[PDB]
């Protein structure tokens, strides 16, 4: 029975999963984009979001330098963390983050995801798009809408 | 042949809308069952 | 535990030719509108996605020469600008990784 | 590697019946195979059939006139009058119309009371090709036949078959030929019901008809047993009744097959065609 | 071993007659010695059976399993030789008229075990073989309806006779 | 075994012996070795035997070929196409003679199971039984337990 | 396999060469028509002489009717797929070019009227003793009526027509070994001018495709 | 007159003659090239034969994916039909539901689905009653339902049809779309397309104002199974592109006095954008009120 329980069994046990979601954040931090196994950057996306909240709080709130202290395990990190991420997403309350799967690992068909900081100078991701609003279906329902509102204001 | 939902061929757009759309007309549909007895009821 | 009898060919087919057993037909196919070739409606295109990490491998070699070590992470915002292009008034204050080709369709200036 | 030789033999024998079961060879005339002498084959016909054939009109009744004008394409190819052979048209069509005559009588005689109509239908079943093609190739017709195409073509075949009915009229004359298509032809006949020889449509019309010629009043279709009447397997009996008598009565699975089975058993009744009537007498003339 | 498979692209029909239908081109191509099981083999080549050449393609290039990249690999090699050296017009006219796999030369080593015991392991191989025809895909059968299970159960009450009698 | 092998229903060629009696069989191929041992009684039988058979049966066209052969054959053809190859190696001439008689009075017919030892189309004179044939009638056909006139 | 094994005394004794000595190059419009002249037939003049040298009953006046002879002969074995009697009719250079091709599919043609006689256009030789042997080049020029159908592996019309002769201007070459005992005149190659109408079109439709790029790769016109 | 059954063989007989006259033009296999200017598959040249590959037929080429999803052709930038053959050396592209402005493709599929409500409305009524076919109007998308105008038998003329009877218009189309029929087109001159709808005079005044706008006079005649009539602009493939079709509502034109023209209207939506059952039936609503071409 595992009703509730909200976290992952990876690694070798709880220490070990709190280290290998900490070099996968590190990692993200100084490339902004990386790939891993599917399910490991779904856990990190978590730690991922807090992080920059963190980060917001400045680099003199010693809770919140302690916090960076351990989560990157390269410390020229955390003034980037505090002077070009946190400020990046100063006017956002949250989706730092944006991740989505790509094509299994060739080696062992591990299912795949690509995740990184939304904002980053990287060539962008071929990010999936819904379909135009010109579509035939698309039109059918504008004209729906038009109709509607003209009913409203009359 | 392939399976298809509800917003898989809506746009940006229409999404918002037809939520918004939907929504309503169930609200509207619950309210107007509100007064039974004014609506030919069974033999009580 | 061990068998009893040997089990016939017979019995051996129901079993291994089992619906069950059988691979199931993909009906999420799709081909991609920007390359053309096949993706996966929930999964990014194969032939895009290296493409992109291509140019971003590229981009990111050209950081490590300027970085020029390890623990050298720059405490300000990057730029890439491809040949023919220099810094906008936005690109001002950060770092510039230059990069000697021209700027891909895909990739847009921001 | 084994001494021996004989069961190295035997098995070359079986791989060759394997190799020509999965690769079967095209069929060729008899007469193309070995042990065939055509004069000796000719002579054997007639002794089969307790027949004086004239051995100079049997042969010309085997030869066809596709046979003679692929016979001189040939002469013309290798640069080669004496093949003045003369086809079978001739003797064909005595035959063909001796037979017809002659069925006509057999049948008029034995079954007075069918139209003609019905014994013209009759006799063209008799002579058609169906019926002559399997008499012909069971009686060695095909083997002596001189044809241009292999396996012989139905109407070449049914064309050689009367051929050799006219070679019997003119060697042998009427009366001996009138045998010949009685054991041959009539014999046909003997488990096959009317109107599966003879293919009618609508046979409650043909019965309004005859009963009419016979001043007879129209029949009237009533219901004699039912069983199942709900189910997808009903049982109907329907009996036909003229001044309220019954004349036949047909089952069937719905009430109209069960009424046009009964029209039919009514028609049999009428032209003598009965499964119980009298066999036909092949007892020899006195 | 034998070798047939590759030399059914090499009968010649004669010239057909100016009144009989085009025969479709028939493609005959295999790959002989796969590192990897017959038995593994027989699901990937079972899916393909009667699809076109692009359906089969496309469930192969998504498969997970090794066989998938090995035998769209033999499918787009005798998808171009069909229409190099078979005179097939349209290359995406074509379906898996047969796919099947068999069972390659194989090699034996030792597995060790406990206690000084031990056992025979077999390096399997395999073959592919696959058979293309042109053409749109053959249609799938219709399941047999009702309509047709009680014609041929009422069939089968028609065809019964009296036994052991007249 | 009956269930191992095929079968069929007696019949006739062309309704034979029906309006006259025609011999089905209609060709005999013999070959004997003019020297082998094993042909023995093969060379006799062409000596005494052959030319008496064919004055009885004139239908019958009979080819003797003489020619090298370890194993004597003769091959008996039928009119409706049927062929037999029977093996006369080291029979004795009387035991030849028996199978050529054998030969001369069968059909061409396969030699498997026959289901029934007798055939007829005409099994029935009177009518063939059917579920009504001994149930008697009711007046105006009513059923068994139906009001009628409601 | 290019070179047997080294320092061996037998050596490959090929029958022909690879190439035309001098090619002929037709004037411009000789279809149409269906100094330097002499000094063209002045070397024609000197190299059959060393044809008629080691064959002294040679004839030019009869060549032309003896070319038409193995052209002819040459290409009715290819309907029949004789290729025992071709390589008495053809070089090996020619042999590939003529069967490779058509190794399985059915060739159907024939000869049908031939509408100019043909003309020895040119008559050389090679260099002497090349590696001990000497051969002659004679090129012909041929203008016939020719039909041909050809047909694929599955007896399906691949290629023209089999009813509808059409016209062949074709300066077919010709060449012998002189000092070969048993050498013979043997149809060597063929010249396509320049000039020469494009061939029939062909039954079937064909797509080229366009560069295979790789995703770092972008597609320049 | 011809009676009904004739009236389409006569047509039928003189749409293939005029076909055959055509095919019987090109010079035994003359050769064209058609380049590939499409963003995927680019540089492909397809070396086709004259008047006789169609689009579709370069589809072939490709892969089944293009042909399943090519709804309309771009020649030369204008759009064709996918199986109308190519006269020339040109350059193609092919058009899908999906581009990112597939207005072209829209009324392509806009004007098909009109003219299969012709077909069903011509072969539904009573010998008995004569229905005469007027045109199909030109409606945007956005107006919600594509309209046919059509004039029924003056007996008819206080009839309104009932539920029941929509209901029987919408199974003969979807009867349309499982027989899957190609739709065939034909450029032919005013003259020949005069003279199969010759028996009927809206077909004429139709016919002649399309020739007047061409120099050429050449009119687009579109053919479904034995229905023949005269198009706008390039039609969609074949019927069985159509998954969700219903004919919503017949109004009554105004003014009645002249000839009561009754425009039938319906809406549908192709396999690849098929609508999910609750958002089909709100444009089934807006699909029955009247739509007023501007
Ligand atoms: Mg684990
Ligand atoms: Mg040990
Ligand atoms: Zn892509």
């Given at each position: 029975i595992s009703h509730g329980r909200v976290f992952r069994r990876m690694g070798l046990g709880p220490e070990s999963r709190i280290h290998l979601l900490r070099n996968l954040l590190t990692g993200l931090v100084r490339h902004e984009r990386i790939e891993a196994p599917w399910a490991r950057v779904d856990e990190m996306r978590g730690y991922a979001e807090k992080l920059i909240d963190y980060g917001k709080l400045g680099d003199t709130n010693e809770r919140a330098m302690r916090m960076a202290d351990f989560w990157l395990t390269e410390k020229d990190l955390i003034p980037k963390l505090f002077q070009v991420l946190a400020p990046r997403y100063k006017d956002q309350t949250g989706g730092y983050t944006r991740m989505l799967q790509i094509p299994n690992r060739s080696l062992d068909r591990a299912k795949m995801a690509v995740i990184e900081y939304k904002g980053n100078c990287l060539p962008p991701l071929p990010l999936p798009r819904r379909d135009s609003h010109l579509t035939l279906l698309n039109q059918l329902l504008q004209g729906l809408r038009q109709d509607l509102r003209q009913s409203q204001e009359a | 042949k392939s399976g298809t939902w509800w917003?898989?061929?809506?746009?940006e757009e229409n999404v918002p809308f037809i939520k918004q759309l939907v929504s309503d007309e169930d609200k509207a549909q619950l309210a107007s069952k509100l007064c039974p007895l004014k609506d030919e009821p069974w033999p009580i | 535990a061990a068998p009893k009898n040997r089990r016939t060919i017979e019995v051996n087919r129901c079993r291994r030719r089992n619906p069950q057993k059988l691979i199931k037909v993909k009906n999420n196919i799709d081909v991609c509108p920007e390359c053309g070739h096949l993706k996966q409606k929930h999964v990014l295109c194969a032939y895009c996605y290296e493409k992109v990490c291509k140019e971003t491998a590229e981009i990111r070699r050209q950081i490590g020469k300027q970085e020029g070590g390890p623990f050298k992470a720059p405490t300000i915002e990057t730029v890439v600008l491809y040949t023919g292009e220099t810094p906008s008034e936005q690109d001002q204050g950060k770092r510039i990784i230059e990069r000697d080709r021209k700027r891909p369709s895909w990739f847009t200036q921001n | 590697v084994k001494k021996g030789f004989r069961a190295a033999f035997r098995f070359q024998k079986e791989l060759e019946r394997q190799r020509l079961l999965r690769c079967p060879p095209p069929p060729v005339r008899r007469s193309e195979k070995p042990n065939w002498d055509y004069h000796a084959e000719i002579q054997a016909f007639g002794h089969r059939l307790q027949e004086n054939f004239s051995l100079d009109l049997l042969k010309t009744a085997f030869v066809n006139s596709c046979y003679i004008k692929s016979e001189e394409a040939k002469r013309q190819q290798l640069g080669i009058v004496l093949l003045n052979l003369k086809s079978n048209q001739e003797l064909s069509e005595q035959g063909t119309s001796f037979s017809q005559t002659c069925l006509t009588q057999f049948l008029e005689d034995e079954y007075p009371d069918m139209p003609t109509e019905g014994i013209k239908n009759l006799v063209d079943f008799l002579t058609g090709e169906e019926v002559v093609c399997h008499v012909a190739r069971n009686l060695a017709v095909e083997q002596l036949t001189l044809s241009e195409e292999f396996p012989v073509p139905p109407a070449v075949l049914q064309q050689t078959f009367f051929a050799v009915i006219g070679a019997l009229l003119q060697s042998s004359g009427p009366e001996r030929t009138a045998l010949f298509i009685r054991d041959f032809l009539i014999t046909q006949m003997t488990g096959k019901e009317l109107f599966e020889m003879w293919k009618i449509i609508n046979p409650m019309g043909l019965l309004v008809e005859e009963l009419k010629k016979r001043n007879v009043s129209a029949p009237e279709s009533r219901l004699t047993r039912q069983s199942g009447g709900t189910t997808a397997l009903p049982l109907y009996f329907v009996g036909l009744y003229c001044d309220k008598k019954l004349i036949a009565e047909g089952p069937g699975e719905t009430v109209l097959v069960a009424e046009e089975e009964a029209a039919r058993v009514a028609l049999r009744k009428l032209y003598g065609f009965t499964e119980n009537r009298r066999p036909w007498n092949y007892s020899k003339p006195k | 071993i034998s070798r047939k498979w590759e030399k059914k692209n090499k009968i010649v029909y004669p010239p057909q007659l100016p009144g009989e239908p085009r025969r479709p081109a028939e493609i005959y191509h295999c790959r002989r010695q796969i590192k990897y099981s017959k038995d593994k083999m027989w699901y990937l080549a079972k899916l393909i059976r009667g699809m076109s050449i692009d359906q089969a393609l496309a469930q192969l290039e998504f498969n997970?399993?090794?066989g998938a990249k090995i035998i769209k690999e033999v499918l787009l090699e005798a998808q171009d030789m069909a229409v190099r050296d078979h005179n097939v017009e349209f290359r995406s006219n074509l379906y898996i008229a047969e796919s099947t796999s068999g069972r390659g030369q194989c090699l034996k080593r030792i597995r060790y075990h406990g206690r000084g015991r031990f056992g025979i392991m077999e390096k399997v191989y395999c073959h592919y073989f696959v058979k293309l025809v042109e053409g749109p895909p053959p249609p799938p059968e219709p399941p047999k309806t009702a309509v047709a299970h009680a014609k041929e159960y009422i069939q089968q009450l028609r065809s019964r006779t009296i036994v052991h009698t007249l | 075994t009956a269930r191992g092998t095929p079968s069929r229903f007696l019949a006739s060629v062309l309704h034979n012996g029906l309006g006259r009696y025609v011999q089905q069989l209609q060709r005999l191929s013999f070959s004997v070795s003019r020297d082998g041992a094993s042909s023995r009684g093969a060379r006799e039988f062409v000596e005494r035997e052959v030319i008496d058979f064919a004055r009885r049966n004139p239908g019958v066209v009979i080819y003797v070929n003489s020619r090298p052969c370890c194993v004597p054959r003769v091959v008996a053809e039928y009119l409706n196409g049927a062929v037999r190859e029977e093996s006369i190696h080291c029979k004795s001439v009387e035991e030849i003679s028996t199978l050529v008689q054998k030969l001369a009075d069968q059909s061409g017919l396969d030699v498997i199971r026959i289901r029934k030892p007798f055939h007829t189309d005409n099994p029935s004179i009177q009518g063939q039984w059917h579920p009504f044939t001994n149930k008697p009638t009711t007046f105006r056909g009513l059923r068994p337990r139906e009001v009628q006139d409601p | 396999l290019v070179i047997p094994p080294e320092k061996s005394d037998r050596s490959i004794h090929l029958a022909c060469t690879a190439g035309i000595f001098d090619a002929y190059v037709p004037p411009e419009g000789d279809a149409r028509i269906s100094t330097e002249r002499m000094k063209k037939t002045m070397a024609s003049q000197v190299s059959i002489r060393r044809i008629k040298d080691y064959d002294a009953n040679f004839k030019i006046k009869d060549f032309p009717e003896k070319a038409k002879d193995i052209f002819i002969e040459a290409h009715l074995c290819l309907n029949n797929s004789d290729h025992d009697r071709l390589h008495t009719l053809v070089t090996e250079h020619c042999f590939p070019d003529m069967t490779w091709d058509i190794k399985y599919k059915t060739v159907r043609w024939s000869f049908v009227e031939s509408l100019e006689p043909s003309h020895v256009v040119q008559v050389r030789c090679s260099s002497m003793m090349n590696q001990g042997n000497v051969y002659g080049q004679i090129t012909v020029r041929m203008h016939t009526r020719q039909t041909l159908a050809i047909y694929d592996r599955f007896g399906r019309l691949m290629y023209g027509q089999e009813d509808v002769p059409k016209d062949v201007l074709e300066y077919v070459v010709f060449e012998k070994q002189l000092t070969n005992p048993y050498g013979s005149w043997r149809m060597h190659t063929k010249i396509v001018p320049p000039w020469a109408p494009p061939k029939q079109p062909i039954l079937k439709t064909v797509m080229i495709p366009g560069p295979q790029l790789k995703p770092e790769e972008e597609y320049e016109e | 007159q011809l009676s009904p059954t004739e009236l389409t063989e006569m047509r039928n007989d003189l749409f293939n003659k005029e076909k055959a006259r055509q095919l019987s033009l090109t010079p035994r296999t003359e050769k064209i090239e058609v380049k590939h200017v499409g963003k995927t598959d680019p540089g492909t040249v397809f070396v086709m034969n004259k008047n006789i590959s169609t689009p579709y037929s370069c589809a072939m080429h490709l892969s089944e994916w293009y042909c399943r999803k090519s709804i309309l052709a771009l020649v030369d930038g204008q759009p064709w039909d996918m199986y109308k053959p190519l006269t020339k050396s040109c350059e193609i592209k092919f058009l899908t539901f999906k581009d990112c402005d597939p207005g072209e493709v829209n009324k392509a599929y806009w004007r098909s689905c009109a003219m299969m409500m012709g077909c069903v409305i011509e072969r539904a009524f009573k010998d008995e009653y004569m229905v005469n076919l007027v045109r199909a109007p030109e409606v945007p998308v956005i107006s919600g339902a594509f309209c046919y105008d059509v004039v029924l038998d003056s007996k008819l003329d206080e009839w309104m049809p009932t539920k029941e009877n929509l209901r029987s218009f919408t199974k003969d189309a979807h009867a349309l779309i499982y027989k899957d029929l190609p739709f065939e087109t034909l450029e032919v001159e005013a003259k020949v397309a005069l003279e199969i709808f010759q028996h009927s005079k809206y077909k004429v005044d139709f016919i002649e104002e399309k020739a007047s706008q061409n120099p050429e006079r050449i009119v687009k005649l579109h053919r479904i199974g034995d229905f023949i009539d005269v198009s706008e602009g390039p039609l969609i493939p074949r019927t069985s592109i159509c998954f969700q079709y219903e004919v919503s509502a017949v109004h009554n034109l105004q003014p009645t006095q002249p000839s009561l023209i009754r425009r039938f209207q319906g809406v549908s939506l192709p396999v690849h954008l098929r609508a999910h059952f609750t958002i089909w039936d709100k444009l089934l609503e807006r699909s029955r009120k009247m739509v007023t071409e501007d």
């Amino acid at each position: 029975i595992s009703h509730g329980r909200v976290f992952r069994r990876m690694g070798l046990g709880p220490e070990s999963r709190i280290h290998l979601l900490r070099n996968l954040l590190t990692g993200l931090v100084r490339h902004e984009r990386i790939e891993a196994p599917w399910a490991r950057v779904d856990e990190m996306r978590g730690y991922a979001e807090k992080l920059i909240d963190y980060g917001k709080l400045g680099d003199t709130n010693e809770r919140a330098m302690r916090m960076a202290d351990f989560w990157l395990t390269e410390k020229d990190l955390i003034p980037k963390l505090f002077q070009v991420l946190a400020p990046r997403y100063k006017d956002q309350t949250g989706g730092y983050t944006r991740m989505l799967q790509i094509p299994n690992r060739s080696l062992d068909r591990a299912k795949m995801a690509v995740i990184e900081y939304k904002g980053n100078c990287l060539p962008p991701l071929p990010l999936p798009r819904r379909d135009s609003h010109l579509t035939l279906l698309n039109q059918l329902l504008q004209g729906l809408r038009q109709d509607l509102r003209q009913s409203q204001e009359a | 042949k392939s399976g298809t939902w509800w917003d898989e061929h809506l746009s940006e757009e229409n999404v918002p809308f037809i939520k918004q759309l939907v929504s309503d007309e169930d609200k509207a549909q619950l309210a107007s069952k509100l007064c039974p007895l004014k609506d030919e009821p069974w033999p009580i | 535990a061990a068998p009893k009898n040997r089990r016939t060919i017979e019995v051996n087919r129901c079993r291994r030719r089992n619906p069950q057993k059988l691979i199931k037909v993909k009906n999420n196919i799709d081909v991609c509108p920007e390359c053309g070739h096949l993706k996966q409606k929930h999964v990014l295109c194969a032939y895009c996605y290296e493409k992109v990490c291509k140019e971003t491998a590229e981009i990111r070699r050209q950081i490590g020469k300027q970085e020029g070590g390890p623990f050298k992470a720059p405490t300000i915002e990057t730029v890439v600008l491809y040949t023919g292009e220099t810094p906008s008034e936005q690109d001002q204050g950060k770092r510039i990784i230059e990069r000697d080709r021209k700027r891909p369709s895909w990739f847009t200036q921001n | 590697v084994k001494k021996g030789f004989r069961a190295a033999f035997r098995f070359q024998k079986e791989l060759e019946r394997q190799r020509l079961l999965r690769c079967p060879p095209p069929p060729v005339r008899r007469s193309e195979k070995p042990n065939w002498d055509y004069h000796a084959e000719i002579q054997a016909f007639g002794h089969r059939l307790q027949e004086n054939f004239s051995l100079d009109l049997l042969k010309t009744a085997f030869v066809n006139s596709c046979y003679i004008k692929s016979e001189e394409a040939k002469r013309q190819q290798l640069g080669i009058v004496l093949l003045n052979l003369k086809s079978n048209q001739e003797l064909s069509e005595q035959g063909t119309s001796f037979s017809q005559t002659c069925l006509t009588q057999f049948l008029e005689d034995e079954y007075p009371d069918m139209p003609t109509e019905g014994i013209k239908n009759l006799v063209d079943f008799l002579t058609g090709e169906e019926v002559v093609c399997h008499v012909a190739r069971n009686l060695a017709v095909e083997q002596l036949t001189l044809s241009e195409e292999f396996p012989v073509p139905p109407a070449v075949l049914q064309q050689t078959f009367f051929a050799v009915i006219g070679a019997l009229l003119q060697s042998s004359g009427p009366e001996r030929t009138a045998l010949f298509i009685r054991d041959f032809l009539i014999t046909q006949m003997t488990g096959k019901e009317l109107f599966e020889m003879w293919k009618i449509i609508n046979p409650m019309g043909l019965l309004v008809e005859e009963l009419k010629k016979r001043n007879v009043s129209a029949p009237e279709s009533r219901l004699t047993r039912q069983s199942g009447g709900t189910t997808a397997l009903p049982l109907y009996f329907v009996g036909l009744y003229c001044d309220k008598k019954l004349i036949a009565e047909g089952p069937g699975e719905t009430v109209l097959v069960a009424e046009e089975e009964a029209a039919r058993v009514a028609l049999r009744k009428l032209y003598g065609f009965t499964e119980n009537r009298r066999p036909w007498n092949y007892s020899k003339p006195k | 071993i034998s070798r047939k498979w590759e030399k059914k692209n090499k009968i010649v029909y004669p010239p057909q007659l100016p009144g009989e239908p085009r025969r479709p081109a028939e493609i005959y191509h295999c790959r002989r010695q796969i590192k990897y099981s017959k038995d593994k083999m027989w699901y990937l080549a079972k899916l393909i059976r009667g699809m076109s050449i692009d359906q089969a393609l496309a469930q192969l290039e998504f498969n997970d399993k090794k066989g998938a990249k090995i035998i769209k690999e033999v499918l787009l090699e005798a998808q171009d030789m069909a229409v190099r050296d078979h005179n097939v017009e349209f290359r995406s006219n074509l379906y898996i008229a047969e796919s099947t796999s068999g069972r390659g030369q194989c090699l034996k080593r030792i597995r060790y075990h406990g206690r000084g015991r031990f056992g025979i392991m077999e390096k399997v191989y395999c073959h592919y073989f696959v058979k293309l025809v042109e053409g749109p895909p053959p249609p799938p059968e219709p399941p047999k309806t009702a309509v047709a299970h009680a014609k041929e159960y009422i069939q089968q009450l028609r065809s019964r006779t009296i036994v052991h009698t007249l | 075994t009956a269930r191992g092998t095929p079968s069929r229903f007696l019949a006739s060629v062309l309704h034979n012996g029906l309006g006259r009696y025609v011999q089905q069989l209609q060709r005999l191929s013999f070959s004997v070795s003019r020297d082998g041992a094993s042909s023995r009684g093969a060379r006799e039988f062409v000596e005494r035997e052959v030319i008496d058979f064919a004055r009885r049966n004139p239908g019958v066209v009979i080819y003797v070929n003489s020619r090298p052969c370890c194993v004597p054959r003769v091959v008996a053809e039928y009119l409706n196409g049927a062929v037999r190859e029977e093996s006369i190696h080291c029979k004795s001439v009387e035991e030849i003679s028996t199978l050529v008689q054998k030969l001369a009075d069968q059909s061409g017919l396969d030699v498997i199971r026959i289901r029934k030892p007798f055939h007829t189309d005409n099994p029935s004179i009177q009518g063939q039984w059917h579920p009504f044939t001994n149930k008697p009638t009711t007046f105006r056909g009513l059923r068994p337990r139906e009001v009628q006139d409601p | 396999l290019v070179i047997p094994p080294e320092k061996s005394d037998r050596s490959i004794h090929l029958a022909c060469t690879a190439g035309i000595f001098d090619a002929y190059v037709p004037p411009e419009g000789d279809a149409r028509i269906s100094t330097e002249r002499m000094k063209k037939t002045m070397a024609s003049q000197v190299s059959i002489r060393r044809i008629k040298d080691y064959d002294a009953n040679f004839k030019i006046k009869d060549f032309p009717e003896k070319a038409k002879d193995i052209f002819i002969e040459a290409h009715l074995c290819l309907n029949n797929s004789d290729h025992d009697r071709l390589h008495t009719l053809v070089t090996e250079h020619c042999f590939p070019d003529m069967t490779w091709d058509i190794k399985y599919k059915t060739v159907r043609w024939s000869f049908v009227e031939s509408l100019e006689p043909s003309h020895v256009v040119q008559v050389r030789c090679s260099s002497m003793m090349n590696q001990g042997n000497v051969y002659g080049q004679i090129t012909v020029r041929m203008h016939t009526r020719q039909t041909l159908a050809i047909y694929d592996r599955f007896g399906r019309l691949m290629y023209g027509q089999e009813d509808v002769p059409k016209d062949v201007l074709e300066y077919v070459v010709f060449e012998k070994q002189l000092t070969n005992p048993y050498g013979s005149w043997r149809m060597h190659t063929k010249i396509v001018p320049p000039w020469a109408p494009p061939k029939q079109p062909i039954l079937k439709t064909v797509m080229i495709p366009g560069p295979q790029l790789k995703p770092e790769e972008e597609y320049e016109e | 007159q011809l009676s009904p059954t004739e009236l389409t063989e006569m047509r039928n007989d003189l749409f293939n003659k005029e076909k055959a006259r055509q095919l019987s033009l090109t010079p035994r296999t003359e050769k064209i090239e058609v380049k590939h200017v499409g963003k995927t598959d680019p540089g492909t040249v397809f070396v086709m034969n004259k008047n006789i590959s169609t689009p579709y037929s370069c589809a072939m080429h490709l892969s089944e994916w293009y042909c399943r999803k090519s709804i309309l052709a771009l020649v030369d930038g204008q759009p064709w039909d996918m199986y109308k053959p190519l006269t020339k050396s040109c350059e193609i592209k092919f058009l899908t539901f999906k581009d990112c402005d597939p207005g072209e493709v829209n009324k392509a599929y806009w004007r098909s689905c009109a003219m299969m409500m012709g077909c069903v409305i011509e072969r539904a009524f009573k010998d008995e009653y004569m229905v005469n076919l007027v045109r199909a109007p030109e409606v945007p998308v956005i107006s919600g339902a594509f309209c046919y105008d059509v004039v029924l038998d003056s007996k008819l003329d206080e009839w309104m049809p009932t539920k029941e009877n929509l209901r029987s218009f919408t199974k003969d189309a979807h009867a349309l779309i499982y027989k899957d029929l190609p739709f065939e087109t034909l450029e032919v001159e005013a003259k020949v397309a005069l003279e199969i709808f010759q028996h009927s005079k809206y077909k004429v005044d139709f016919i002649e104002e399309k020739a007047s706008q061409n120099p050429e006079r050449i009119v687009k005649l579109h053919r479904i199974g034995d229905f023949i009539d005269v198009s706008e602009g390039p039609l969609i493939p074949r019927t069985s592109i159509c998954f969700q079709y219903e004919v919503s509502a017949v109004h009554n034109l105004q003014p009645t006095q002249p000839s009561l023209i009754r425009r039938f209207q319906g809406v549908s939506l192709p396999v690849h954008l098929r609508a999910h059952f609750t958002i089909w039936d709100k444009l089934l609503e807006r699909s029955r009120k009247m739509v007023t071409e501007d």
